[PDB]
Short mmCIF file of C-alpha atoms and ligand atoms in Angstrom, two decimals:
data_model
loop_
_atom_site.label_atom_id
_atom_site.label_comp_id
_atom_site.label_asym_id
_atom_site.label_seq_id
_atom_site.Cartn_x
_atom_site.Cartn_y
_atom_site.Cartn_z
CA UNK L 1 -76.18 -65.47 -56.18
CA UNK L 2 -74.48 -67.37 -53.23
CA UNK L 3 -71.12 -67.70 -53.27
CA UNK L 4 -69.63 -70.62 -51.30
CA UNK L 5 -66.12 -71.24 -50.67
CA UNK L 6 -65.10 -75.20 -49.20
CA UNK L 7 -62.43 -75.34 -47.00
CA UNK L 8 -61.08 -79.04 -46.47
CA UNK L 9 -58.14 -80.67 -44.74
CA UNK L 10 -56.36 -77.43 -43.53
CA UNK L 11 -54.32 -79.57 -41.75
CA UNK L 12 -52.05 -76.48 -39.37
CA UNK L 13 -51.38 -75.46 -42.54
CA UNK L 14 -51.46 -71.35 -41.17
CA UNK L 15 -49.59 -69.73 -44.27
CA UNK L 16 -51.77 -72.04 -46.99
CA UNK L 17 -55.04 -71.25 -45.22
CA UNK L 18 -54.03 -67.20 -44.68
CA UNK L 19 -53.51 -67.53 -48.54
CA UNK L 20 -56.64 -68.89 -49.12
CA UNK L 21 -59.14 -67.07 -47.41
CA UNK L 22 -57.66 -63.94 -48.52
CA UNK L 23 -58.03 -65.38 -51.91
CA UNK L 24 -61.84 -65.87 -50.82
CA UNK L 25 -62.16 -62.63 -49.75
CA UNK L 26 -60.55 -61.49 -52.87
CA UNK L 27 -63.21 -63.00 -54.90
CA UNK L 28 -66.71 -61.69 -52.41
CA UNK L 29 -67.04 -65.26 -50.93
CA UNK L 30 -70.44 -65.09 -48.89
CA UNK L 31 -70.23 -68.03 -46.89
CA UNK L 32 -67.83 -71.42 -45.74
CA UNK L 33 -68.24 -74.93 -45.53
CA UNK L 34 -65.96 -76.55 -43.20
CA UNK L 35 -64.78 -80.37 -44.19
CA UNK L 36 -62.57 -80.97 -41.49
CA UNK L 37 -59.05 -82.23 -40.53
CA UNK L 38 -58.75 -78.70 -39.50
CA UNK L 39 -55.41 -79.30 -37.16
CA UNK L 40 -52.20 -81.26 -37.34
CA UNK L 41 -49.60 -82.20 -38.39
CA UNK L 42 -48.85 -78.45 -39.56
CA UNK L 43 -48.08 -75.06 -37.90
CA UNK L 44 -51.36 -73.37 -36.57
CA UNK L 45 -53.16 -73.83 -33.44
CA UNK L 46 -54.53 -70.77 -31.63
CA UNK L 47 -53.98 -68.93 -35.27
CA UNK L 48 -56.05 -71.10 -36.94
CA UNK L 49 -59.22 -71.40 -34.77
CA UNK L 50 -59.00 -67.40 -34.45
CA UNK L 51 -59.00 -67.06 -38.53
CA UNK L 52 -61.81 -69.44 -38.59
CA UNK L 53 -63.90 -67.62 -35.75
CA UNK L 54 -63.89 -64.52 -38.02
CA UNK L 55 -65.83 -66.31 -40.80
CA UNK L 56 -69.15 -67.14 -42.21
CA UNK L 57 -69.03 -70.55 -41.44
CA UNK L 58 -72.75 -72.06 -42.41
CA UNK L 59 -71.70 -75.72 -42.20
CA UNK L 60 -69.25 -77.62 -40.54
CA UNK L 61 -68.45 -81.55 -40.69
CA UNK L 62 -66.32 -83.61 -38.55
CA UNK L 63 -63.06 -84.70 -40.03
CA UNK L 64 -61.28 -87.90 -38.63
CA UNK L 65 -58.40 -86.21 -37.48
CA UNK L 66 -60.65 -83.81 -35.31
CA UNK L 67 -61.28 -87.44 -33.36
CA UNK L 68 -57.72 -88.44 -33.52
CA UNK L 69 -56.79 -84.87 -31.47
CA UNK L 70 -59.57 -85.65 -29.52
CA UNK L 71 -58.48 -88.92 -28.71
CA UNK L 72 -54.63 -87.89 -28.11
CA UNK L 73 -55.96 -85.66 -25.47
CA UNK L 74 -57.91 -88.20 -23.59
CA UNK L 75 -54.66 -90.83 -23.98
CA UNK L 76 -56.87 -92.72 -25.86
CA UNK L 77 -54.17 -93.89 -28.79
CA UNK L 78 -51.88 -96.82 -28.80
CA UNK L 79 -48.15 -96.08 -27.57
CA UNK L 80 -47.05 -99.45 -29.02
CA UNK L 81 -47.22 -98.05 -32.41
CA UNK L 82 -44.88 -95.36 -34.14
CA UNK L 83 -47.92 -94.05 -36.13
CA UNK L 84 -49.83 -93.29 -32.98
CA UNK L 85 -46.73 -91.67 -31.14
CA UNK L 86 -46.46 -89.65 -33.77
CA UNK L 87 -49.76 -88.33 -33.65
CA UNK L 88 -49.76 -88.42 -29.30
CA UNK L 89 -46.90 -85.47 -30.15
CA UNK L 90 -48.93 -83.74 -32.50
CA UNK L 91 -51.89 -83.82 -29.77
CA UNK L 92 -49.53 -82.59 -27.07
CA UNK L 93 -48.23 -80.10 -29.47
CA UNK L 94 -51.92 -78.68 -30.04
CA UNK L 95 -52.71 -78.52 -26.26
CA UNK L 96 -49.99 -76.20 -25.54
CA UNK L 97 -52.48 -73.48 -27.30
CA UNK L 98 -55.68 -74.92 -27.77
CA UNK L 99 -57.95 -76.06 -24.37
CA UNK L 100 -59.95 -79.30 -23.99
CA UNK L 101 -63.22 -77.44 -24.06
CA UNK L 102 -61.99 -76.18 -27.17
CA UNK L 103 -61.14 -79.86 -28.60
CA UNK L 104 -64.17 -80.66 -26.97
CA UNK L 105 -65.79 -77.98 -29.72
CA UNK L 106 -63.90 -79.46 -32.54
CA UNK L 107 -65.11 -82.81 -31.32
CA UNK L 108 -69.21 -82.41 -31.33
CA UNK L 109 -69.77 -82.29 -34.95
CA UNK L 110 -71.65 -83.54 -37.08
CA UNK L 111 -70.41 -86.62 -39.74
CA UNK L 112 -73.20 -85.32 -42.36
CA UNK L 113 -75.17 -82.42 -43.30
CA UNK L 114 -78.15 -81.31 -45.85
CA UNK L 115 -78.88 -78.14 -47.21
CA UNK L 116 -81.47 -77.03 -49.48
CA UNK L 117 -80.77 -74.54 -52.60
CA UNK L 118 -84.32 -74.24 -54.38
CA UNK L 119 -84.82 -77.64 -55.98
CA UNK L 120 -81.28 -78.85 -54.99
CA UNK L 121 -80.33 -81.35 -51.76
CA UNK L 122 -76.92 -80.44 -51.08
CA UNK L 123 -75.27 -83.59 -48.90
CA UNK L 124 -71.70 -82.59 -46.98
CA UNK L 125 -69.22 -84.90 -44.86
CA UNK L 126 -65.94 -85.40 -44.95
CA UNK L 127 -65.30 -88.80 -45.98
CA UNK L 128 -68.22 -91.10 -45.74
CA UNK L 129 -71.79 -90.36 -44.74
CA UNK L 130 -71.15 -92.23 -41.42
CA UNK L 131 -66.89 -92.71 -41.49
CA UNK L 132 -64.63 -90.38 -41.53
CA UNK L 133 -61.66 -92.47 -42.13
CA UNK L 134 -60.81 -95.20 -44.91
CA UNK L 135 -59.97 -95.34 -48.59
CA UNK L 136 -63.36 -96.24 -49.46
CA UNK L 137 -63.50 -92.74 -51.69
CA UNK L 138 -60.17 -92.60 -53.54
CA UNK L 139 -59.17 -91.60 -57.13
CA UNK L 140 -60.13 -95.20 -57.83
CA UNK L 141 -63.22 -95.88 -55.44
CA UNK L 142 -66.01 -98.73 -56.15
CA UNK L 143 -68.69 -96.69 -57.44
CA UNK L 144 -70.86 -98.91 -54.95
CA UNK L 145 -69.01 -96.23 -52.10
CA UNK L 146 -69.67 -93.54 -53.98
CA UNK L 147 -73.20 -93.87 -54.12
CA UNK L 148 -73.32 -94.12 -50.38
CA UNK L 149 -72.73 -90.44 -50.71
CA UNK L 150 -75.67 -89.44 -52.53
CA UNK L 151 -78.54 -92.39 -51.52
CA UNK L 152 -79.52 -93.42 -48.38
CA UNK L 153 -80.31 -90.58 -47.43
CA UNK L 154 -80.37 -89.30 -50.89
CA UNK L 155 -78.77 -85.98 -52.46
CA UNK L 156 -78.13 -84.27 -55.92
CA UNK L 157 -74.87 -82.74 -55.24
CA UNK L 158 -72.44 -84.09 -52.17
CA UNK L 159 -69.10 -82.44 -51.44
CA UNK L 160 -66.88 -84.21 -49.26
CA UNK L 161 -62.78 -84.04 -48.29
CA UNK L 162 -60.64 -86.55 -46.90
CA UNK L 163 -59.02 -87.25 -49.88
CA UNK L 164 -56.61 -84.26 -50.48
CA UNK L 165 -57.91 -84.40 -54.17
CA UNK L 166 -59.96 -82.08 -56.26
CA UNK L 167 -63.32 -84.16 -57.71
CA UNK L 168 -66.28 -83.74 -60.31
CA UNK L 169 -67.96 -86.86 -60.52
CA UNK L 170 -71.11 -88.57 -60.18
CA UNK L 171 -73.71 -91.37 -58.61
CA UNK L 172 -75.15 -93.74 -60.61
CA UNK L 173 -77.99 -91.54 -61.06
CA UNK L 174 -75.89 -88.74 -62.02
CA UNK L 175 -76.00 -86.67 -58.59
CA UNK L 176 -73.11 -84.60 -58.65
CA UNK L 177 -69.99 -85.82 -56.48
CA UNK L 178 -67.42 -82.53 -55.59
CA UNK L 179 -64.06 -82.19 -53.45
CA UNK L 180 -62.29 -79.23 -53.30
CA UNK L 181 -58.94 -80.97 -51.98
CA UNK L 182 -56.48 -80.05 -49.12
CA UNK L 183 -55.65 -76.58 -49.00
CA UNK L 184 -52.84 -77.90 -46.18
CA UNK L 185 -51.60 -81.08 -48.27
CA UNK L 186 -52.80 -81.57 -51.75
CA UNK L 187 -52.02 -85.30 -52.90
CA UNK L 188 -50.88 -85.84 -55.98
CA UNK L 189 -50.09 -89.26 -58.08
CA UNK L 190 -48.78 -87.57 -61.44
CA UNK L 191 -44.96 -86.71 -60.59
CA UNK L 192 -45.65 -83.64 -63.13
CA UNK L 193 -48.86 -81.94 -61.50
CA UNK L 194 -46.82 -82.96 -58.16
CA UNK L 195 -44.79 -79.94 -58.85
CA UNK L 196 -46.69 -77.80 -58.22
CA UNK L 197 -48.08 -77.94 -54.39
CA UNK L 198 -50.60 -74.58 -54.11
CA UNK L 199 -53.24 -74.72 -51.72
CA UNK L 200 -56.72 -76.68 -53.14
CA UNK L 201 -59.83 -75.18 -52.50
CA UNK L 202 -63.07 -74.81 -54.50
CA UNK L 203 -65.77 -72.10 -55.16
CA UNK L 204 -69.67 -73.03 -55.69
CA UNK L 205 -71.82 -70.73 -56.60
CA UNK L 206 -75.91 -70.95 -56.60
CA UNK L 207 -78.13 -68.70 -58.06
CA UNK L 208 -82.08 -68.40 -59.00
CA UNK L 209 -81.69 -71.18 -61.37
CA UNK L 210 -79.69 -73.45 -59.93
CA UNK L 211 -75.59 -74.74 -59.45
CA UNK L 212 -73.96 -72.13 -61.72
CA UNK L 213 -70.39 -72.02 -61.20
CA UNK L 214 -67.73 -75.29 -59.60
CA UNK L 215 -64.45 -73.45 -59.25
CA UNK L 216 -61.41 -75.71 -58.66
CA UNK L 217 -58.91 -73.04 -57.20
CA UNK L 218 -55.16 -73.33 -56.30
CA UNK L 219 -53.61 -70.76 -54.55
CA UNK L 220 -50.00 -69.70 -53.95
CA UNK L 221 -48.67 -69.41 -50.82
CA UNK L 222 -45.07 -68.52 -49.46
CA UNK L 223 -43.83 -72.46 -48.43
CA UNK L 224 -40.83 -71.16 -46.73
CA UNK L 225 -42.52 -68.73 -44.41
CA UNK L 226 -44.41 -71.95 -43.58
CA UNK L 227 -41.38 -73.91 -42.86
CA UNK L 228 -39.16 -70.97 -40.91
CA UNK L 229 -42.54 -71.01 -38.73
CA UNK L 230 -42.36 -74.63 -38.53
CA UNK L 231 -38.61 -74.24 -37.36
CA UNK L 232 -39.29 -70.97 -34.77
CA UNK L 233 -42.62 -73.12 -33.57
CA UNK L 234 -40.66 -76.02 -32.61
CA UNK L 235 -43.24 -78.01 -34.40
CA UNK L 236 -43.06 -82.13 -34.08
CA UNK L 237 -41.66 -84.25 -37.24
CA UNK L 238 -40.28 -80.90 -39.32
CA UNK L 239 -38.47 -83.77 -41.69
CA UNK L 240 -42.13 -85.05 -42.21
CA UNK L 241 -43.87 -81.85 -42.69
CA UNK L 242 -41.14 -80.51 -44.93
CA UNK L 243 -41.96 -83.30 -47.22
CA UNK L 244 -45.46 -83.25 -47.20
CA UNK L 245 -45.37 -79.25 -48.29
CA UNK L 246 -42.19 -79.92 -50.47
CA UNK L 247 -42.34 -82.87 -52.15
CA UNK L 248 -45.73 -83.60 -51.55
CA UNK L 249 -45.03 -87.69 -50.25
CA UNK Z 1 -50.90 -66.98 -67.22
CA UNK Z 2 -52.79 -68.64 -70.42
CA UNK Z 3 -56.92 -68.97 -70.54
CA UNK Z 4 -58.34 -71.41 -72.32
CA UNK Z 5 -62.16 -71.87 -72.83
CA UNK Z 6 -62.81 -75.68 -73.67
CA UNK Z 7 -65.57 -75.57 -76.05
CA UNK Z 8 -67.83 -78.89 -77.02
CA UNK Z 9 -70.81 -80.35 -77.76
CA UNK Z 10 -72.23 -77.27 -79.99
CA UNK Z 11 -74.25 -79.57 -81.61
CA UNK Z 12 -75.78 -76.58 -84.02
CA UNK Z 13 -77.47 -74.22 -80.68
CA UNK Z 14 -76.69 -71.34 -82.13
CA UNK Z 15 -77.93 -68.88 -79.39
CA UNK Z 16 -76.31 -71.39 -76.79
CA UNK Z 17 -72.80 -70.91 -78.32
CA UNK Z 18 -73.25 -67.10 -78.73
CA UNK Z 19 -73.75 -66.66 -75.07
CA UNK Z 20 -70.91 -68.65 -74.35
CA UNK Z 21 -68.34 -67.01 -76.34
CA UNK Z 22 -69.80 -63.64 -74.93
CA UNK Z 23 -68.93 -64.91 -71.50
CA UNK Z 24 -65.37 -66.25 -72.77
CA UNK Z 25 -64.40 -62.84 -74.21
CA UNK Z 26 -65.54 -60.91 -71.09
CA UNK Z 27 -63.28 -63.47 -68.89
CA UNK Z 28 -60.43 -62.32 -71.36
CA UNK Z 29 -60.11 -66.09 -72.84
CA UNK Z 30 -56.93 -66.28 -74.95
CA UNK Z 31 -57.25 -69.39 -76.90
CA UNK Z 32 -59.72 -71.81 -77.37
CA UNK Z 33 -60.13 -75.77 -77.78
CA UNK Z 34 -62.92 -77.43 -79.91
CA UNK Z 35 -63.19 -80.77 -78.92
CA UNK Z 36 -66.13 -81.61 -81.65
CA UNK Z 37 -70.17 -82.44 -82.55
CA UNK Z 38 -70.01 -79.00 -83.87
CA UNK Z 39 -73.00 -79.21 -86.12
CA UNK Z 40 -76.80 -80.40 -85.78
CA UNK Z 41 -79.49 -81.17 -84.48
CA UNK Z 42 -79.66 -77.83 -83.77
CA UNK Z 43 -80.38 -74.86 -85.48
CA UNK Z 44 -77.12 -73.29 -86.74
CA UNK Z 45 -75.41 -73.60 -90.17
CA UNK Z 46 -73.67 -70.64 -91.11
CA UNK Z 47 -73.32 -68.26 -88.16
CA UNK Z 48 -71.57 -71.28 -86.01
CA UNK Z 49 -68.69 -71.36 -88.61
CA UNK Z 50 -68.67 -67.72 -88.56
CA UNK Z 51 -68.41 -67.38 -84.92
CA UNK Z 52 -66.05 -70.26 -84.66
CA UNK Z 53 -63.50 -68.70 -87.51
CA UNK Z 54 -63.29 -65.45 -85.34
CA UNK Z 55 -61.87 -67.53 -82.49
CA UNK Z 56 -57.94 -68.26 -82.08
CA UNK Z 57 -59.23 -72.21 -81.97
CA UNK Z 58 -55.38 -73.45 -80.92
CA UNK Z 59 -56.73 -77.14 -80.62
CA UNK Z 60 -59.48 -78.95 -82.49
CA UNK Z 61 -60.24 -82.74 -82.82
CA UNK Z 62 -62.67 -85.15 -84.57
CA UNK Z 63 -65.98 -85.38 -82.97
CA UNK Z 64 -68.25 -88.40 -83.89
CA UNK Z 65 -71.13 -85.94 -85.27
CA UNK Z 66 -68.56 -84.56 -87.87
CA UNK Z 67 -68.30 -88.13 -89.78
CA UNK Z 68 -72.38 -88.63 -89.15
CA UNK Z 69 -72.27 -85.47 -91.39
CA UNK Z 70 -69.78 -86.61 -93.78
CA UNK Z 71 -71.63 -90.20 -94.66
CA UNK Z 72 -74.70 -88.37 -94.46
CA UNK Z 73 -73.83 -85.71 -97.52
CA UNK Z 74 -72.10 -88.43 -99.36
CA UNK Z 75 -75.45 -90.30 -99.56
CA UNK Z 76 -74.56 -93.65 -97.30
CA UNK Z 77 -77.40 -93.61 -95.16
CA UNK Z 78 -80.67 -95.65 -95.34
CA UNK Z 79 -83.96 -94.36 -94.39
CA UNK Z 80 -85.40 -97.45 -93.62
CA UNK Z 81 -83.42 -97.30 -90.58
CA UNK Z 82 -84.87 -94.46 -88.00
CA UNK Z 83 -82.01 -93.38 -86.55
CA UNK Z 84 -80.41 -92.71 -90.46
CA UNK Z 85 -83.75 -91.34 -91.27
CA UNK Z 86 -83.24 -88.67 -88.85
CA UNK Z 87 -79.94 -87.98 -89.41
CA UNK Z 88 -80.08 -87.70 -93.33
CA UNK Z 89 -82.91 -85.37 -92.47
CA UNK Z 90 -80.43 -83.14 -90.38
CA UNK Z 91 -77.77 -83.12 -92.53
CA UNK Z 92 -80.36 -81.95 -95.88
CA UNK Z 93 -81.01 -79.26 -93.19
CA UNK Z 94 -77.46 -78.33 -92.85
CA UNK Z 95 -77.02 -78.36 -97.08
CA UNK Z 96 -78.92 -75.88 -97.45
CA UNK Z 97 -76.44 -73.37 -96.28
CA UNK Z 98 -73.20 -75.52 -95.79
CA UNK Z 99 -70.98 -76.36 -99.09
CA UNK Z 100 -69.03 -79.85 -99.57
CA UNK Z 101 -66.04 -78.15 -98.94
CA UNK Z 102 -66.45 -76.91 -95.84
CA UNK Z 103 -67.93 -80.11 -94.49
CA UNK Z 104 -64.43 -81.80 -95.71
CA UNK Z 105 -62.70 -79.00 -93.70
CA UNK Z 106 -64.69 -79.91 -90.60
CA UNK Z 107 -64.10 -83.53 -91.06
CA UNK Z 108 -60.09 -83.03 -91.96
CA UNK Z 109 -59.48 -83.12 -88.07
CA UNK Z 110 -57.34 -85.76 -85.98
CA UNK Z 111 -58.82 -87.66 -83.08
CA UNK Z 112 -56.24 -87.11 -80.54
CA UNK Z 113 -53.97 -84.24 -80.29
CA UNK Z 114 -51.28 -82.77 -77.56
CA UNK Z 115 -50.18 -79.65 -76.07
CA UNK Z 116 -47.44 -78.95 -73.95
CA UNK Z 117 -47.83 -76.19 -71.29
CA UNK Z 118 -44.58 -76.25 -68.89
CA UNK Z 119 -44.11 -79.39 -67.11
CA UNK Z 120 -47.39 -80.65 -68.00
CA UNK Z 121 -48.49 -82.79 -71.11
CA UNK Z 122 -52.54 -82.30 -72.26
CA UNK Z 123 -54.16 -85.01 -74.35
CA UNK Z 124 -57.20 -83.65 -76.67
CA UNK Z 125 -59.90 -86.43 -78.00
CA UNK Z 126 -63.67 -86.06 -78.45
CA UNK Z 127 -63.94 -89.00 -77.10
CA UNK Z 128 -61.56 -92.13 -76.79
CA UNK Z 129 -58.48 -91.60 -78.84
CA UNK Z 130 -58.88 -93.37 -81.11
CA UNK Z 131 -62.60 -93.82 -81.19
CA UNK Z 132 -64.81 -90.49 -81.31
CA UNK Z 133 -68.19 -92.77 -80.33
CA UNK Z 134 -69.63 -95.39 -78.21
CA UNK Z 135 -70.51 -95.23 -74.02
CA UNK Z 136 -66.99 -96.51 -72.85
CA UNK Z 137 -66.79 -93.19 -71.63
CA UNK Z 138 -69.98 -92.41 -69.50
CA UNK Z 139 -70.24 -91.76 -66.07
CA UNK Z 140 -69.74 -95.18 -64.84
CA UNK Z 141 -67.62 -96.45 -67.32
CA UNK Z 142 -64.74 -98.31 -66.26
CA UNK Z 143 -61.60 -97.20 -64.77
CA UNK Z 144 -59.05 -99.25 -68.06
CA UNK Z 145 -61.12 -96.96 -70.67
CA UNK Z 146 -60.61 -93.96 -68.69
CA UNK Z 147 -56.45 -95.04 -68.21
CA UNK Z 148 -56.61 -94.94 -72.14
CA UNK Z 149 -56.67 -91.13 -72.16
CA UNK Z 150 -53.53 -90.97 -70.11
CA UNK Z 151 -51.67 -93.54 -71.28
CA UNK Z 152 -50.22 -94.96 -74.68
CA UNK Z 153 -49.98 -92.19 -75.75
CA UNK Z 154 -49.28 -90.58 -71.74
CA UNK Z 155 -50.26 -87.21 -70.36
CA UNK Z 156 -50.96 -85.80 -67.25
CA UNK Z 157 -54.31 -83.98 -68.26
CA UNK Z 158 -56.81 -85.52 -70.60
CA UNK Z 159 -59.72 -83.53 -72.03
CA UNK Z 160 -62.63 -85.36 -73.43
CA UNK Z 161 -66.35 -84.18 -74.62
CA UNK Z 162 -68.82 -86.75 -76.28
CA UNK Z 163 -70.40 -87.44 -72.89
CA UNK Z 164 -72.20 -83.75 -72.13
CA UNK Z 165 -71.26 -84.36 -68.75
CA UNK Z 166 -68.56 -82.00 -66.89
CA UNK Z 167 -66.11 -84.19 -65.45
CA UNK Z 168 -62.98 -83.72 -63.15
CA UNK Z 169 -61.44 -87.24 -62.30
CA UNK Z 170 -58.34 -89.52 -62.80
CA UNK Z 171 -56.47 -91.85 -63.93
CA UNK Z 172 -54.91 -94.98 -61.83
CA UNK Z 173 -51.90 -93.24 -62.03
CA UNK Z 174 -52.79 -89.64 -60.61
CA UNK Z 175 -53.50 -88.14 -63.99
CA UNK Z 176 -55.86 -85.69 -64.44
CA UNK Z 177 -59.18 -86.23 -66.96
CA UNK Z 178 -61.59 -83.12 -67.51
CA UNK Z 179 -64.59 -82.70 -69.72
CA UNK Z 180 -66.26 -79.12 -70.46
CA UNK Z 181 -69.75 -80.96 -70.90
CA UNK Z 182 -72.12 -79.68 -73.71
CA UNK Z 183 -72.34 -75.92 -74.72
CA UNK Z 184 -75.83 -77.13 -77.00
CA UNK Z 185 -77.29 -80.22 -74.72
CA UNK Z 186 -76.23 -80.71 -71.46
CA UNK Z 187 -77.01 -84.53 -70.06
CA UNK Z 188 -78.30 -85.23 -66.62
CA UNK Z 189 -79.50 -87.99 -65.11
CA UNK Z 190 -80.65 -86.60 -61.72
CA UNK Z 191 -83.96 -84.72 -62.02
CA UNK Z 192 -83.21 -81.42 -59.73
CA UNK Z 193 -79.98 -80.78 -61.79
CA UNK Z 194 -81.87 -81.60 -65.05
CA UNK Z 195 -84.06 -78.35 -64.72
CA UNK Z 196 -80.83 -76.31 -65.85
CA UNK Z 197 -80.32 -77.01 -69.13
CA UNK Z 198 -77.63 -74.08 -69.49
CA UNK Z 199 -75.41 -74.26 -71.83
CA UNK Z 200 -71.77 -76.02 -70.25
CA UNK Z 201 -68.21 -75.14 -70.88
CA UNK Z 202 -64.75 -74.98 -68.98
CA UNK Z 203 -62.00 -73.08 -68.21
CA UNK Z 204 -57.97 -74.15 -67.65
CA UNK Z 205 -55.90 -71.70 -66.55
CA UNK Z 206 -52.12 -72.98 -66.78
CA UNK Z 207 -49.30 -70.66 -65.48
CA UNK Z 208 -45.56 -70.62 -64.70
CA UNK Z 209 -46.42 -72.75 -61.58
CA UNK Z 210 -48.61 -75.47 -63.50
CA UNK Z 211 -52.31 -75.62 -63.39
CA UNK Z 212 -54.07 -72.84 -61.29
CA UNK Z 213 -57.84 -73.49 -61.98
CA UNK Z 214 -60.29 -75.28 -63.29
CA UNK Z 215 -63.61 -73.39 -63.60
CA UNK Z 216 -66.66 -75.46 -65.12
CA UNK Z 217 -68.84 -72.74 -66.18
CA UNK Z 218 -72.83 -72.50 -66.79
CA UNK Z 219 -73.71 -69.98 -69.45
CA UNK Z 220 -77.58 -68.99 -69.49
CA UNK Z 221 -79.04 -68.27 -72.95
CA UNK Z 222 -82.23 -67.51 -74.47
CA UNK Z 223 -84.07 -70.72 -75.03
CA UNK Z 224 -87.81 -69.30 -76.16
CA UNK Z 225 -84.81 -67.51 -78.79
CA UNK Z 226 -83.32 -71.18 -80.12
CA UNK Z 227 -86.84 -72.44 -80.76
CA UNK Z 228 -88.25 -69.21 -82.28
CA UNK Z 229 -85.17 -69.69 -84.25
CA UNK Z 230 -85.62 -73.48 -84.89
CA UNK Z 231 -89.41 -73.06 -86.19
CA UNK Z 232 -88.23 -70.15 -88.50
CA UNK Z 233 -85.59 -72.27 -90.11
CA UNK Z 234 -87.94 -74.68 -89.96
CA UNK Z 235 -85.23 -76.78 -88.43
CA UNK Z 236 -86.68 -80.91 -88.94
CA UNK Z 237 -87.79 -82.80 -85.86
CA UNK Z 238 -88.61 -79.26 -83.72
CA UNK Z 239 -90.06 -81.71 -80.90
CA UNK Z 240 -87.31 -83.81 -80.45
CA UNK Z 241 -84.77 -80.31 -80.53
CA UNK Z 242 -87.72 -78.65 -77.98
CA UNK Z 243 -87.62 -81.71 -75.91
CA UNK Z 244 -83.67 -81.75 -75.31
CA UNK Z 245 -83.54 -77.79 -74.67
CA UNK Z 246 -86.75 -77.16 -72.17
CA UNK Z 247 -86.81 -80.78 -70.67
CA UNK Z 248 -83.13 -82.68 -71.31
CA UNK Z 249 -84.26 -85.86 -72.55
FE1 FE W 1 -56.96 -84.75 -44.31
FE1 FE W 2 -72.17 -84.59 -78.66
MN1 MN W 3 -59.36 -87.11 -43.27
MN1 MN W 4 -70.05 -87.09 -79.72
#
């Protein structure tokens, strides 16, 4: 048995991911998939690469936001609009701890991946085989998007992220579709299960005969510890960030 | 923290459902829900009830296979008619062993039930709620059947079986809707996955903070065991029961 554990949409969330992965570790996790949106808006620059760094990371897709930090750097984003200043301070924020050869590392990967497990083809990106960004694969997406995921080129099981929403569904030709959520920001629609705003991850586990175990996880972690390190940090847009971890809007 | 092993889609594999309530008792499962098709094609008679009555079954619901059983021991089906011909043929099967009133007891079940854990309302159906049968359901089915779990009556989780698919999606409104697949005949329509035919279940976990996992389980179990058993019985239609346990179609 291999035990995977898929991180997705970390988003500076330090106390969420420290929860996490020692949940992971917790449970013998053998190896990581990395979905992206790894930095921003949240707490953890320098902390979060470093916590990374020390893992068995086997695959490792490029989130939008990853191209948005990327882009702040460079001054590549629009100062006419609020949405892009607010992300220009998040940037500048990041760069205080984190160099451009570094971004530059965050930067060069790649939008899709395949992996073989026996007879399985394993497809991984974080949104789209070939964007990032969108709404194409929400709660509600055309099932024509979804089966962008797993044809073309084809696979039986695709994870992706992007979405901040945990996912078992399929293709048309029933390949599996997975997403383990946001263990940074978890999106929820239901004001009830909107209550509760644990870190999202999921387990997979493969063994001689095939996908064994899908493991959905939340995990607790100490919000206002997050915040008061939010506060110390200085970080950009606390009114924002408090709601996002909060409230969950 | 409450564990609760969602358990469907028997369908009469004995050996199936004995390896899956050994690997609910070793996770410590404290209740379980039986969403239905509890009985035939398959092999068991007897035993299942047994098993099933030393379970603390805190939910159960109508599946579609329970009425096929009903009509077919009340002599309502014609033979002229294939699909009747087959099932009357099951059902003589299951007479042997099974009295009338313990096939009212398994049809005396409602279609849609509720629990309340916290915060958060659960909806319990085989299939629709107020229809265990028919494909309205399936993989692609549309996104207004799906919003009929969730709504009128409303909760924020739905659990469904009927489909032998395992399922983690939503409704338009952010509800959740979650399917355990098929303990006795798991469905796939991509090849690669269909050469594991292990048995499926699922696991909720619900605590003070909500929902804390979802764990959609694969339980291996002797198959070369379920046909020895099946010739021995001399179970009806062994090729058609072979072909859905070694090949899944
Ligand atoms: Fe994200
Ligand atoms: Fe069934
Ligand atoms: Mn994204
Ligand atoms: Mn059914």
């Amino acid at each position: 048995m291999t035990k995977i554990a898929l991180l997705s949409d970390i988003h500076g969330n330090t106390t969420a991911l420290e929860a996490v992965l020692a949940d992971a570790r917790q449970l013998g996790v053998d190896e990581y998939w990395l979905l992206g949106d790894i930095l921003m808006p949240g707490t953890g620059r320098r902390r979060i690469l470093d916590l990374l760094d020390q893992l068995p990371i086997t695959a490792r897709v490029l989130g939008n936001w990853e191209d948005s930090l990327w882009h702040g750097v460079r001054k590549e984003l629009d100062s006419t609009r609020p949405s892009q200043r607010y992300l220009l301070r998040q940037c500048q924020y990041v760069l205080e701890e984190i160099s451009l050869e570094e971004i530059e590392v965050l930067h060069n990967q790649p939008l899709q991946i395949h992996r073989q497990f026996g007879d399985l083809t394993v497809g991984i990106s974080h949104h789209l085989p070939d964007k990032n960004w969108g709404r194409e694969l929400i709660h509600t997406g055309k099932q024509e998007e979804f089966d962008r995921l797993v044809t073309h080129p084809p696979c039986d099981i695709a994870v992706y992220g992007h979405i901040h929403q945990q996912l078992l569904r399929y293709g048309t030709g029933g390949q599996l579709i997975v997403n383990p959520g946001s263990i940074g920001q978890p999106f929820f629609l239901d004001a009830q299960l909107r209550k509760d705003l644990r870190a999202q991850y999921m387990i997979l586990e493969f063994d001689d005969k095939g996908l064994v175990d899908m493991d959905f996880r939340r995990v607790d972690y100490d919000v206002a510890a997050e915040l008061q390190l939010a506060k110390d940090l200085r970080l950009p847009y606390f009114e924002v960030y408090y709601e996002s971890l909060v409230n969950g809007i």
